[PDB]
Design a protein around this ligand. Sequence first.
Ligand SMILES: [Cl-]
Ligand SMILES: [Zn+2]
Lengths: 21, 29
Amino acid sequence: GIVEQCCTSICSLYQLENYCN
Amino acid sequence: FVNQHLCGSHLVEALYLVCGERGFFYTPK
Ligand SMILES: [Cl-]
Ligand SMILES: [Zn+2]
C-alpha cells in the first residue's frame, strides 16, 4: 500500500495525490 | 518535484500538504 509505496521504497508527490478524497 | 522516503507521521504530513482541503485517507497495511 501507501507504506510500501513511500516508506519502504520512495514515492512522488504525484503518487500521494492518489490518496486524496 | 522529487521522490523521497516518507515514513510514519512524515507521510501523513506530506498527504496533508498535497491534498489539503480535499481530505485524504491513510490506510496502512
Ligand atoms: Cl526522522
Ligand atoms: Zn521524524
